[PDB]
Amino acid sequence: ADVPAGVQLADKQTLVRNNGSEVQSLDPHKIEGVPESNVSRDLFEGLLISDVEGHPSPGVAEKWENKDFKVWTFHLRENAKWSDGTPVTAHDFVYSWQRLADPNTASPYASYLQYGHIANIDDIIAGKKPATDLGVKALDDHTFEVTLSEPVPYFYKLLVHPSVSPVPKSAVEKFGDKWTQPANIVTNGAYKLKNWVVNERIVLERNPQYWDNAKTVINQVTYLPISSEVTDVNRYRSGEIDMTYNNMPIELFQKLKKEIPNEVRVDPYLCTYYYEINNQKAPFNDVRVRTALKLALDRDIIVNKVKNQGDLPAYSYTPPYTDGAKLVEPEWFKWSQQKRNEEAKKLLAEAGFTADKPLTFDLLYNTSDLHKKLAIAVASIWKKNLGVNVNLENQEWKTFLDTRHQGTFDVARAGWCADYNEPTSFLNTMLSDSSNNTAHYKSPAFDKLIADTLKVADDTQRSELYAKAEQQLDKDSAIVPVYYYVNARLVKPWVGGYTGKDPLDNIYVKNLYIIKH
Ligand SMILES: [U]
Ligand SMILES: [U]
Ligand SMILES: [U]
Ligand SMILES: [U]
Ligand SMILES: [U]
Ligand SMILES: [U]
Ligand SMILES: [U]
Ligand SMILES: [U]
Question: Which residues hold their Cβ within 5 A of ligand 1, which is an ion?
Answer without folding.
Answer: 11
